[PDB]
Amino acid sequence: HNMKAFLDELKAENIKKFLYNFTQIPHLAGTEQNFQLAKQIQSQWKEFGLDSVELAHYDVLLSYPNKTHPNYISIINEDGNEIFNTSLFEPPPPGYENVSDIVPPFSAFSPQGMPEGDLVYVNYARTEDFFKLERDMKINCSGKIVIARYGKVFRGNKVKNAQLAGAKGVILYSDPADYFAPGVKSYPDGWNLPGGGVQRGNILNLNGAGDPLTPGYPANEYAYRRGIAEAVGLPSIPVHPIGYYDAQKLLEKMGGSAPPDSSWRGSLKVPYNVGPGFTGNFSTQKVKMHIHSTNEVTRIYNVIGTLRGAVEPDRYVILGGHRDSWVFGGIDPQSGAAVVHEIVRSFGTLKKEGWRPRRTILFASWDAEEFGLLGSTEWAEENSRLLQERGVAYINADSSIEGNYTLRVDCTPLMYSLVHNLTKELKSPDEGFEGKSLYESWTKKSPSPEFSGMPRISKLGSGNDFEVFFQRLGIASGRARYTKNNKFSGYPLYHSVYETYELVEKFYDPMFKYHLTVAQVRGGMVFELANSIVLPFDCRDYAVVLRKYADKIYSISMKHPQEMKTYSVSFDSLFSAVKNFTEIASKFSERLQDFSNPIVLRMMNDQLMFLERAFIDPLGLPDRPFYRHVIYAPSSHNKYAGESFPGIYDALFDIESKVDPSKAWGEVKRQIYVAAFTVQAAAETLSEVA
Amino acid sequence: HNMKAFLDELKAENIKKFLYNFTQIPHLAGTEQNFQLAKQIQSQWKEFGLDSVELAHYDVLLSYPNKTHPNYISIINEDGNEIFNTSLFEPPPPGYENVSDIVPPFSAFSPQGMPEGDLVYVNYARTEDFFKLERDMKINCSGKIVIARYGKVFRGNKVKNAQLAGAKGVILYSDPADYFAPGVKSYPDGWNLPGGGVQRGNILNLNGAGDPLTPGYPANEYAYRRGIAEAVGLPSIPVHPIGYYDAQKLLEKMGGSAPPDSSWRGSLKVPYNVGPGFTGNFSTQKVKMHIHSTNEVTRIYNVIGTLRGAVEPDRYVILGGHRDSWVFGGIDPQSGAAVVHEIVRSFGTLKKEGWRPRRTILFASWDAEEFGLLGSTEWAEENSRLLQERGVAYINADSSIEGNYTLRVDCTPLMYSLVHNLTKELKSPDEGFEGKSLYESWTKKSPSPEFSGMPRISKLGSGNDFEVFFQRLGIASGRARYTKNNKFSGYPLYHSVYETYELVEKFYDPMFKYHLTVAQVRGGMVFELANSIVLPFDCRDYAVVLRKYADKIYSISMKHPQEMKTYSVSFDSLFSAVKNFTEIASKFSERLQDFSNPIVLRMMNDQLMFLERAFIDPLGLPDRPFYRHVIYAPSSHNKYAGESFPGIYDALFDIESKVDPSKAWGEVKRQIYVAAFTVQAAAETLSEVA
Ligand SMILES: *[C@@H]1O[C@H](CO)[C@@H](O[C@@H]2O[C@H](CO)[C@@H](O[C@@H]3O[C@H](CO)[C@@H](O)[C@H](O[C@H]4O[C@H](CO)[C@@H](O)[C@H](O)[C@@H]4O)[C@@H]3O)[C@H](O)[C@H]2NC(C)=O)[C@H](O)[C@H]1NC(C)=O
Ligand SMILES: *[C@@H]1O[C@H](CO)[C@@H](O[C@@H]2O[C@H](CO)[C@@H](O[C@@H]3O[C@H](CO)[C@@H](O)[C@H](O[C@H]4O[C@H](CO)[C@@H](O)[C@H](O)[C@@H]4O)[C@@H]3O)[C@H](O)[C@H]2NC(C)=O)[C@H](O)[C@H]1NC(C)=O
Ligand SMILES: *[C@@H]1O[C@H](CO)[C@@H](O[C@@H]2O[C@H](CO)[C@@H](O)[C@H](O)[C@H]2NC(C)=O)[C@H](O)[C@H]1NC(C)=O
Ligand SMILES: *[C@@H]1O[C@H](CO)[C@@H](O[C@@H]2O[C@H](CO)[C@@H](O)[C@H](O)[C@H]2NC(C)=O)[C@H](O)[C@H]1NC(C)=O
Ligand SMILES: *[C@@H]1O[C@H](CO)[C@@H](O[C@@H]2O[C@H](CO)[C@@H](O)[C@H](O)[C@H]2NC(C)=O)[C@H](O)[C@H]1NC(C)=O
Ligand SMILES: *[C@@H]1O[C@H](CO)[C@@H](O[C@@H]2O[C@H](CO)[C@@H](O)[C@H](O)[C@H]2NC(C)=O)[C@H](O)[C@H]1NC(C)=O
Ligand SMILES: *[C@@H]1O[C@H](CO)[C@@H](O[C@@H]2O[C@H](CO)[C@@H](O)[C@H](O)[C@H]2NC(C)=O)[C@H](O)[C@H]1NC(C)=O
Ligand SMILES: *[C@@H]1O[C@H](CO)[C@@H](O[C@@H]2O[C@H](CO)[C@@H](O)[C@H](O)[C@H]2NC(C)=O)[C@H](O)[C@H]1NC(C)=O
Ligand SMILES: *[C@@H]1O[C@H](CO)[C@@H](O)[C@H](O)[C@H]1NC(C)=O
Ligand SMILES: *[C@@H]1O[C@H](CO)[C@@H](O)[C@H](O)[C@H]1NC(C)=O
Ligand SMILES: *[C@@H]1O[C@H](CO)[C@@H](O)[C@H](O)[C@H]1NC(C)=O
Ligand SMILES: *[C@@H]1O[C@H](CO)[C@@H](O)[C@H](O)[C@H]1NC(C)=O
Ligand SMILES: *[C@@H]1O[C@H](CO)[C@@H](O)[C@H](O)[C@H]1NC(C)=O
Ligand SMILES: *[C@@H]1O[C@H](CO)[C@@H](O)[C@H](O)[C@H]1NC(C)=O
Ligand SMILES: O=C(O)CC[C@H](CP(=O)(O)O)C(=O)O
Ligand SMILES: O=C(O)CC[C@H](CP(=O)(O)O)C(=O)O
Ligand SMILES: [Ca+2]
Ligand SMILES: [Ca+2]
Ligand SMILES: [Cl-]
Ligand SMILES: [Cl-]
Ligand SMILES: [Zn+2]
Ligand SMILES: [Zn+2]
Ligand SMILES: [Zn+2]
């Protein structure tokens, strides 16, 4: 009963069976079908061997189209005739066409409205696209309808950016440049997005809050709710997504200025003129949106399974991923959920033979992840005192595949050594690496930009259920999946009705060998975290990255040498703290090596568990109280991306444009002090205790 | 080497020697004399046997009079002649008269100014005194100078109340009604306040922030400081304290309305007319203040001694009290500091014989307590991550005596059983209880209002160095001292130049037997907390008080039955949570009794240590982010008093006067939900862990 026993028990054939079982009907959050699947998983996890399996339910704000009053966009002529209408539904894939309850494309949490106006094209609607338009091209978006292509950043960041530019509506569309790979056919005959395909998705800006109505507290039976006008994160302008057939019709008539450069041109046979409005002949036509979706408080259900630890039952290692999908969820999330189900089955097989892990393992099937990480966040709000005093680590398990090229890992530096060591022990599933390790294929295909013979491991931001555990509570977190060779844009059929079981079985992973490889990485990590006598964290790896992040933020500031002189902006404290951390971590690692004494063992493992916790500031980041980690936060310009020393980064961002430089540079210095203090305080938790 | 060995080593004669040694010269915070005493204590604690003894220094905002431009108040006639001036210094006591560096009476952190105007007399300047004046007597304080007597509430609350009433200055004075006990002589021939005596003290409203310039972060070498205009807690109007000879001169000419009732009359031979202004003949005379004190960033020094634990060195039991005094500090704080010094000596004697406590004991001599708990708060800000994951308990040690009548204990319910059990083992020092226990004398002289044959134990608010540990960080805290038979007003010579060694030795405790009794209670508590195998906390005692506090807050709300019907205000969730807590605590106590297993032992002791921690809300109380405990906070009307369910209490306070009842009652319901949620979450930390 060791790790090898556990890993050998995992089977590709079982992952395939579960994936098929989870993807026959839609499992939209708050629907009866999704509740039924929750009850099924609860049942099976009990049969598989877990000690306890419970549903934790909450009542949260969700959003749905109006079934009898469809959302659509028109071009309207000078007499108010709607001369072109976008589609009311995606053409269903073969053999489905008669499935009911497929939600039509919509942007969850869009307000209602029927705005009409002239279009402006804003590329990906990134912060820098809006700077280009407004500062360089001197185009004003105020009172316009903006059209933006999906890709590059989280869609909620686009809508926030459009709102602050003064837009009165936003139309999001999938351009073939970003969602149609050359030389591959459209679904059902390949994995590309057809012109009628549309990406669903929420457009909230919650900044970690969870349910819009109950920030800070679980949305239980007696919860006090904010009124809709005070809810967190809701957009103030209507938003709707469309496919590229419809986009072509809206973009083909565009006039005004030419695109400022080629990085603004997608692959449609149109000019990609920025506008505002249509060319001379159509100058009197307008665009009109019709959005009628409603927000409603709805019950959601998480399944929480416990396997009690034999030695340290009050230390929790958590494996979690979501169960709700926009439609069938063939990749997102069921390729992850199927992997979690097979991991639970394997741990339960060991348990039935009398084994128990050293620490407690909790398994979670989260609900309403697609509506803003609601299920994981509410549960973590409810259980925050247990998690912050007992939580060892959180390993996420959303989509296992988004390509079939190589491994993609994002995690805390504390898990770098664990990931390197485990992947060296695992077989590569890749063509041309038979008999080689996963570490070898991964390092070859995704080399570290910094180091020779090491793979890339990225930072954690947000955009998945680890967010509350890592950014709010400071629990060491990690994720691993197979990916493509567009990092933040999604695979072509992302959030479309075409993301089905057949997509996966025919085009992504017919032998389920990439799924199996991901189950071995996720399950391998959980097993080591839950069973290793000393926690498998290496504090020296945090010291290395802290120096890199300090160099990088210093370099950004140093683009403004005159201001650093004028305002006496010194990074000396932060480098001093990083030096101290490096020195203390080196000595702690010696003791961890040099130290039969279980209280000594519980003391050193507590120092390792609470090291991530030490990077939490209880006052949070500026205007984002639920992002409390001082080293990492989700980028203010792109929730999906992690940013390092975020409080200093945001103080410096676009600082040359601030009207009161004294005040702006004062705030940079404040954030340097907070960062240096927190690094030093984290270092001190690794000193001898008395 | 048991508790009896420890307690028998403590000697009254040693406490007397230390008290004399600490009270020969003033030890004002930020002065050279106070730094010298810090170095002396550091030296002696090393000689006494501690493992390490360090100075932790910070640079914080302090306040001092201007030596060449004295503060005083005048009555000024219509030509601007100052016809009466208050005193520039207190007449020094016998044998001192030539001591230098006695700071004259002033209100620390008063702004500078020379306001002149008509006087209004506002009794104790409590919230209810201002309601009486403004609502019932229809007197307007706007643009007036207010005169208030000390007593009943913290002086900073008086100044806040005067500021919000629109006052342009505040004069505080000591009335013989509150500071002259009938039948006792004035100092030097008894313990009463003479007419030239004046009470110093700060008038800040920091709400737990610590140094006004660095809220949230330690005021270390690289700290970023707020500008004075954004500092926390500073009064916006001048303030000055005077004795009752001077007060009589200002009050004797008062006109306008008569006092509304006898509870507004002190013991001076004056009418106690409320004003505004003087009677007809003097109606053209005004009062003029002259305040010239300055705020300045100044270095302060805490001494921190460590006695490393033999079994659990990463669990900290902390005994702390302050060292800075306004003048000689014969009671406040040196009667406490002398007791701490003798406790350290006793623990060091055991240590030199080879003993070590089970857990780590930290001993602290805090600086700048008199200027707003600055030293303890800054240190706790620096070390917050260690304290919140390792802090077992904090026992405070300010003044050991404020009378000689009986024991006065304020603590968390988790320490009630510990205090009852220890005091039953200790000998009473009281006249007529020879051969009886301390428990017996204390229960007889201070009976519980609730229970038969039990002593009174009060709630913790603020006004001393335990505040950051308990209200911000949620570490179980307690305090114990001898007291009089005016609870919040101070003994007569409080903060005056007359509070000397001779005061104590002649009038309070000539045999040092009350000091010895307090050293046995404080030291006894530390010894049990640091040495008991199971932590000596009883969670069932928290369950009992929670029900009492729930009944009480319900009763306040029920004065408004029509509004509770209209707005559907239910306390059902809170009573349900209190019921659950009672049930879970009962079962946890059974397991703690029923459970050789040290990991099981470390698990249960962690549940006990983290139970106080579970009452912390990371979002804090409304507009008071550093008061985070949901069951207790310092009263918003009197920092010295604890308030239970403070978030609900403040939502209900004066609610009949709010202009938007819907909104006001909405906030009561929000606070009930937060309280019920936090009680339930604390209960869940005592459930089986997995
Ligand atoms: C990294 O770790 C090191 C410890 O290994 C730690 O060093 C500490 O640095 C502080 C700040 O530099 C030192 O503070 C000094 O302390 C002495 C007393 O020991 C004071 O006299 C000093 O104050 C004088 O000098 C200042 C600067 O010129 C003046 O501004 C001031 O008015 C005084 O004249 C000063 O406070 C401290 O002694 C060391 N501790 C050591 C060496 O053990 C460093 O701070 C750590 N880095 C971080 C970011 O925490
Ligand atoms: C004190 O401890 C007890 C547990 O011993 C705990 O009881 C829990 O109370 C909640 C709230 O009352 C119960 O929640 C119910 O759960 C069921 C499913 O189990 C739901 O069907 C219920 O919802 C229906 O009914 C509601 C009320 O009429 C409707 O508003 C709703 O729309 C649904 O129709 C409801 O959510 C929960 O089951 C129990 N758990 C038990 C008994 O084990 C209680 O909450 C604790 N107190 C506090 C303050 O936490
Ligand atoms: C997914 O698999 C589950 C579990 O095997 C299936 O649910 C079971 O269906 C059988 C036969 O209809 C019932 O007797 C059981 O009660 C169900 N078990 C449960 C819910 O635990 C389910 O039919 C499969 N779903 C699909 C779409 O194939
Ligand atoms: C776009 O859809 C709109 C709404 O369904 C169509 O306009 C409606 O047409 C019907 C039938 O002619 C009328 O009775 C409604 O009053 C119209 N409603 C409007 C203008 O809001 C429109 O015909 C469609 N356009 C195209 C090109 O198909
Ligand atoms: C990853 O594996 C390496 C190589 O085995 C581990 O480092 C060794 O650990 C042993 C056991 O303490 C030491 O005696 C060796 O000196 C280490 N070798 C080194 C550092 O080169 C490392 O601990 C593993 N990382 C984990 C488990 O997180
Ligand atoms: C308080 O007691 C201390 C310690 O006994 C005295 O300080 C010592 O004084 C002697 C003789 O002057 C010196 O040789 C030592 O170096 C001092 N020891 C220290 C500072 O640790 C101090 O004199 C006493 N103070 C008063 C006012 O009586
Ligand atoms: C109260 O004190 C003030 C200030 O010291 C006294 O007024 C000063 O008196 C001297 C000497 O006569 C003058 O030179 C100053 O110009 C006065 N300054 C003022 C009015 O601000 C005043 O005499 C004192 N009053 C009493 C009753 O002693
Ligand atoms: C205070 O003392 C009482 C009486 O000794 C302690 O309660 C007893 O504890 C023992 C040891 O577990 C039990 O077997 C008895 O049944 C308890 N007696 C009771 C509850 O009446 C109590 O634990 C002490 N409190 C402390 C140390 O916090
Ligand atoms: C959906 O369609 C129409 C819009 O007015 C009507 O049937 C109903 O009010 C709508 N339902 C809502 C608002 O949820
Ligand atoms: C953008 O246009 C709106 C239209 O009225 C106007 O209010 C706003 O000032 C304009 N901003 C700039 C910078 O041109
Ligand atoms: C899976 O791998 C093969 C090998 O390169 C490739 O042809 C296929 O397109 C890949 N699938 C996806 C969806 O990338
Ligand atoms: C103290 O007295 C006078 C007031 O102007 C002058 O000597 C000096 O400025 C003052 N010192 C201060 C402001 O600290
Ligand atoms: C109190 O007096 C001031 C004096 O101008 C005035 O501004 C204020 O409105 C008065 N308030 C009441 C309630 O009388
Ligand atoms: C100390 O105790 C005696 C006995 O009642 C009393 O006379 C004396 O006033 C007390 N001291 C104080 C300061 O209360
Ligand atoms: O709201 C979020 O933070 C992300 C939700 C969801 C994450 P997933 O698509 O499940 O990866 C999305 O990006 O639309
Ligand atoms: O600022 C405070 O919270 C209290 C300081 C001090 C407490 P102490 O007099 O030392 O009891 C006072 O009440 O003036
Ligand atoms: Ca919530
Ligand atoms: Ca501070
Ligand atoms: Cl993932
Ligand atoms: Cl005290
Ligand atoms: Zn997902
Ligand atoms: Zn998704
Ligand atoms: Zn004191």
Ligand SMILES: [Zn+2]
């Ligand atoms: Zn004091």
